[PDB]
Design a protein around this nucleic acid. Structure first.
Ligand SMILES: [K+]
Ligand SMILES: [Mg+2]
Ligand SMILES: [Mg+2]
Ligand SMILES: [Mg+2]
Ligand SMILES: [Mg+2]
Ligand SMILES: [Mg+2]
Ligand SMILES: [Mg+2]
Ligand SMILES: [Mg+2]
Ligand SMILES: [Mg+2]
Ligand SMILES: [Mg+2]
Ligand SMILES: [Mg+2]
Ligand SMILES: [Mg+2]
Ligand SMILES: [Mg+2]
Ligand SMILES: [Mg+2]
Ligand SMILES: [Mg+2]
Ligand SMILES: [Mg+2]
Ligand SMILES: [Mg+2]
Ligand SMILES: [Mg+2]
Ligand SMILES: [Mg+2]
Ligand SMILES: [Mg+2]
Ligand SMILES: [Mg+2]
Ligand SMILES: [Mg+2]
Ligand SMILES: [Mg+2]
Ligand SMILES: [Mg+2]
Ligand code: NA
Ligand code: NA
Ligand code: NA
Ligand code: NA
Ligand code: NA
Ligand code: NA
Ligand code: NA
Ligand code: NA
Ligand code: NA
Ligand code: NA
Lengths: 50, 114, 112, 63
RNA sequence: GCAAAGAUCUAACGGAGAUAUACUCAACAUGCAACGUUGGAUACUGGAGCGGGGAAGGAUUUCGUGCCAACGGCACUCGUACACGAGUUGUUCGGAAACUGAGCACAACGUUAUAUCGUUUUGUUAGGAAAGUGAAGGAACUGAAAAGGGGCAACAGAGAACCUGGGAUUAUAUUCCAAAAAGAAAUUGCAUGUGGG
RNA sequence: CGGGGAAACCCAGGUGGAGGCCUGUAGCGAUGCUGACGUGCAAAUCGCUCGUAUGAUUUGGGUAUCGGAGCGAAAGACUCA
RNA sequence: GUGGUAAUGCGGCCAGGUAACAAAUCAAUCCUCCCACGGUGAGCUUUCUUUUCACCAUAAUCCACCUUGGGCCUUUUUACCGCGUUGUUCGGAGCGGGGGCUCAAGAUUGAAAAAUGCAUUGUGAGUUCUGCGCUAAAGCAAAAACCUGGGGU
RNA sequence: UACGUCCCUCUCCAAACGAGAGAACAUGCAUGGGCUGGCAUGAGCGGUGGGGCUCGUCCCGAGGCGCUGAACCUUGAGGCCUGCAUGCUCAGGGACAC
RNA sequence: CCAACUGCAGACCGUACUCAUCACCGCAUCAGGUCCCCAAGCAUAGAAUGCUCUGGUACAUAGAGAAAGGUACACUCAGGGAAGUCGGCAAAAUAGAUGCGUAAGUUCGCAAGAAGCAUUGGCUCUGAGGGCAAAAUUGCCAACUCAGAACUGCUUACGGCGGGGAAUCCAACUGUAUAAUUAAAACAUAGGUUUG
């Protein structure tokens, strides 16, 4: 609801920033191995719980 | 409430009367402007007085002048009544479209176009 | 008919969260908080605990910001005791002191 | 329409009553109404000096 | 097998989702089924509601524009899905600053091979010297009087100075609005004039 | 408050609103159908019927007592399927 | 500091008070619903319907100053009788009548405020805060913060 | 190649689905009329009614009487009559046989 | 020194959305579970039950459609009426309100809604029950309830709503209690006694 501590709010903000896909030129770099993010999170599948 | 009612008393309905000073209503038919005779006949034949339609005696008088129908009475009426009767007449003569009634003054109705 | 909601972020019907229904100039029905009241200035509890005459029942900030007349009276012990209690104390003081003086004088006159 | 009929007393018979007599018209309300009427009348008579205090007190007790 | 919670019909727009033929052939007998929005019709919930707000829990699911591979156990032109871009405004609202409660246990002391143990609100630490500044007088210093150490524990108890209107958003509002503050108040700290003293 | 009686007391009409009182919603439970389901809607649920519903009542948050230990209107019940 | 016979107007330390506390009964204001009068808009209209539906709003904060419910003052003194509640009671420890002081809750007049909002002003029922002052071998949390007085300064 | 058979379409003595009995411009289908049956006297209008209201009249009133064995329904999972009346059909289409 | 006036200043964190037949827990968008506030009209005793204005919704795969056999929160049945079965299991059955009437037993409180009999619609009328404004008199007005009468009708016709009686065993009573096969006669209880 409305109440949360500022420390918890900042942790949630960091997670929101991390939840993004890989930019396209990373795949064009030389010797590249990354295709998908593979650390994507969905609010309905896995819970952070903090 | 103070006196119990009876069913047979619905035969006579007594309309309340003013203390003094006849009230006057006016209906304007300039914008729609023959028909005035029909309208006046309809009003004098349909207006109710104390219960009965048509025979209104002399407690209510009507007149048409300068495209304006006038009603003078010493009997307590409602301005809404002569809007209801006019809507009735317009429906019967099949012109409820493109014509409407609007209050203009404190005691006057006015016809208009849509 | 219309239905209302809480507006001050506390949603429980306790003795401190009392509300009233108000119709505004804009033709809507809202909820406004009802202020808490006070019982007023009283006589001491062991002496009867009666509400004192000439004093007003004011809450915290009102009592702080009001003037002295509202909470006291010009007599002695104004705003603490009532008129009958003051009269009884005056009479008791005088009579007890007189009895004490008489007894001590009698003792000294017997001694001398 | 039905309310005017019921004001004339038309649909309130034995076969239409469904709740108890006290549920429909409680007896405590009737008693309070009657006793207040009687006390008001007695006070008015005493004020208008039709009866005296001696008669008033006896009537007040019997009411 | 996909049967609890009664139920949908119609026209016009939209869309690749059609009125999709080898010909003969007027047409039916050779392109079925299903989708969104708007209008109309018919029903359901029935104020202990498939109504409008909050706590715990969740943490961007909110909003707009697109998209329709996978997922929404049938379907989709639609989505709490996917992509991009945005959104949360306070002297007074809730908390803290600043109360105490059932309670907890830092210091001190004691005990234990071992503190990672015990006592610690029935006024109340500890064999126990736990007070650090008012007024002062002749700008700061100096030191009289005050038994019983420090702290936490209630977003429903105590406490707590603000209300309406808005043509003000795509999404926030007792939080935004500008000199005619749309406006009208209340309260706190420090200063300045007036009056009284 | 009315009537009776020598007296002790007796007969009657109102007012009032008591109780681990009664019928009955919400709530808190779970008797029967030995119903339905029994590769379920569900690792205990559904329907009707049933117990109680001012009290030894129901419920939110905070706090306190655990592994040969805790807690128990006592069934070897319960202590994160 | 200062008026009134009075109830009571007005300009360190110590003792009390507010915070601060159950049930039932009965009865206000606010709000909701209904009815009666009007005004404005829309619906029905083969026939009937002086008709059916919707709307008619007033925040906080402030001035000035009538009701009804408690407590009290002064005057004239109550013969076991009087007062009073729906209800279980009050009186020489001061009933009732006359005149007053005060408290709580409302009403009214006005400033705000039409400059706003939308396209009137009267009855009856129901519900809160409020008042009616304060089961039991069960008997109604505390503190901060604040208020008044007694003294000295 | 021919004879023909099956599907699509229509009917119901058959029928879970297949299979069956039939028709294939045919009173075949549709609507209406008449019959046979069911219920029980329609909407509307009008001069007996316990009572009541206003000026011998004029009105409010449950019910009753008349028009009125009226009104409505009657083949549809499928009653009758063309040895009763009209309307629609306008080269039936496809696959096998091959 | 005291008040108002006036000037300037008024810091920190929360604030989107949800709160559930899709946003939380149950492996899931699961017929299970989850605290608080506001709460309209009519019938009616009514927060029972049925229907409706405002707000919300047409989402839970659909179409055609007479097999047997099933499930149901769906019904009827001639004559008989428990003969069925371990056993009236299951179903039926009683039913609101008002008047009259009510046994044995008993801790005098109850048993008791004991049992049982009667009435009830519609319409048109009559009587009783009050207030404030000037007298045991005049006007004006509100709100509903009860009782009595004439006329008239029934196909006994929404929903909702106890079947009753005579006995025996056990436990005095209200309560608790094996979450997921046992709700009892078990446990508790007031009362009684003993011990330190
Ligand atoms: K320790
Ligand atoms: Mg299958
Ligand atoms: Mg299926
Ligand atoms: Mg199934
Ligand atoms: Mg419905
Ligand atoms: Mg209900
Ligand atoms: Mg799918
Ligand atoms: Mg979208
Ligand atoms: Mg996403
Ligand atoms: Mg609080
Ligand atoms: Mg605050
Ligand atoms: Mg929003
Ligand atoms: Mg019971
Ligand atoms: Mg055992
Ligand atoms: Mg009460
Ligand atoms: Mg057959
Ligand atoms: Mg909610
Ligand atoms: Mg669910
Ligand atoms: Mg209801
Ligand atoms: Mg039979
Ligand atoms: Mg028999
Ligand atoms: Mg046998
Ligand atoms: Mg049975
Ligand atoms: Mg028992
Ligand atoms: Na959290
Ligand atoms: Na009684
Ligand atoms: Na269904
Ligand atoms: Na403590
Ligand atoms: Na604290
Ligand atoms: Na009980
Ligand atoms: Na079973
Ligand atoms: Na099965
Ligand atoms: Na919000
Ligand atoms: Na069990």
């Amino acid at each position: 609801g409305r109440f949360k501590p500022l420390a918890v709010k900042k942790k949630y903000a960091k997670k929101m920033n991390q939840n993004k896909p890989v930019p396209y030129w990373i795949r064009l770099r030389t010797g590249n191995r990354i295709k998908w993010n593979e650390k994507r999170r969905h609010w309905r599948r896995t819970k952070l719980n903090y | 409430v103070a006196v119990r009612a009876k069913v047979g008393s619905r035969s006579y309905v007594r309309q309340k009367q003013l203390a003094k000073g006849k009230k006057v209503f006016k209906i304007d038919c300039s914008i729609p402007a023959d028909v005035l005779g029909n309208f006046e006949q309809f009003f004098q034949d349909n207006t109710k007085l104390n219960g009965r339609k048509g025979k209104l005696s002399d407690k209510v008088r009507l007149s048409m002048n300068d495209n304006v129908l006038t009603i003078s009475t010493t009997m307590a009426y409602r301005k809404k009544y002569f809007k209801y009767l006019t809507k009735k007449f317009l429906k019967k003569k099949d012109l409820r479209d493109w014509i409407r009634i609007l209050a203009t003054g404190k005691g006057t109705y006015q016809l208009k176009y849509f | 008919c219309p239905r209302v909601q809480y507006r001050r972020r506390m949603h429980y019907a306790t003795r401190g969260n009392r509300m009233k229904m108000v119709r505004t100039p804009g033709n809507k029905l809202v909820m406004q908080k009802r202020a808490k009241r006070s019982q007023g200035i009283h006589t001491p509890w062991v002496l009867g605990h009666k509400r004192l005459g000439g004093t007003k029942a004011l809450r915290h900030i009102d009592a702080r910001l009001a003037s002295r007349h509202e909470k006291s009276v010009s007599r002695a012990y104004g705003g603490v005791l009532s008129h009958d209690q003051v009269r009884d104390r005056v009479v008791r003081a005088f009579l007890v002191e007189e009895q004490r003086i008489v007894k001590q004088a009698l003792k000294e006159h017997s001694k001398m | 329409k039905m309310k005017e009929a019921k004001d004339m007393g038309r649909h309130n018979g034995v076969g239409r009553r469904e709740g108890s007599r006290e549920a429909r018209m409680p007896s405590k309300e009737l008693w309070m109404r009657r006793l207040r009427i009687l006390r008001r009348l007695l006070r008015k008579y005493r004020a208008d000096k039709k009866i005296d205090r001696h008669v008033y007190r006896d009537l007040y007790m019997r009411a």
